[PDB]
Design a protein around this ligand. Sequence first.
Ligand code: CLA
Length: 173
Amino acid sequence: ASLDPKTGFPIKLCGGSASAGCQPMTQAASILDKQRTVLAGKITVAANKVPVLTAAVDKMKTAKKPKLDRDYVLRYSALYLTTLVDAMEQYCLRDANGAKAAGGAGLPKFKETLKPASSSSLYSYVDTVKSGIAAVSAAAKAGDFDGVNKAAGDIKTAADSFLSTANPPIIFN
Ligand code: CLA
């Protein structure tokens, strides 16, 4: 019904009718819906790791000689924020062009010729996270501890907002 906070994994038997059965061979979910639960689970893991940065930045400022580890803030941004932004963009793509993005147009390639992730209803939330990445990097260069904390909070609100409007089908295959 929801996705695990850390692992991100998902948390009726009729004859002649799929009846949205969870059991395999009775599953009514499309491969697109299964791809959407995967992307949503990956969005869930990255957003739930935003609290971990907030704690690290608080430990940095409380230290006797406060210093901002540009390397930690930039490495967390490289490891979690790129993940979250790319996954949000992919969810937006699958929503905008439907099956075409699930492999219906072939191997991922340049000149995709499918509806872009931009112009999606949920794309505005992806723009908020892109601003959050820029703030996390700008604050780290500046040395502003408060800037990193709020920017991570802005990303956390945006990712939670995305999932709520997305209403991703949770599929236990
Ligand atoms: C065995 C290796 C393996 C495994 C387990 C996965 C697993 C995954 N990949 Mg990866 N991937 C792999 C190899 C693998 N990949 C390779 C080699 C490539 C390069 C071609 C990719 C390229 C790739 C991309 C580009 C994407 C994934 C995605 C995914 C996720 C969703 C699965 C999916 O899209 O199925 C989709 C499967 C198909 C479209 C067809 C494959 C054939 C199916 C699985 C078998 C059906 C059997 C059927 C019942 C019998 C025949 C029926 C008859 C009618 C024909 C999942 C985490 C997606 C994702 O969400 O991750 C971000 C995604 O966007 N993968």
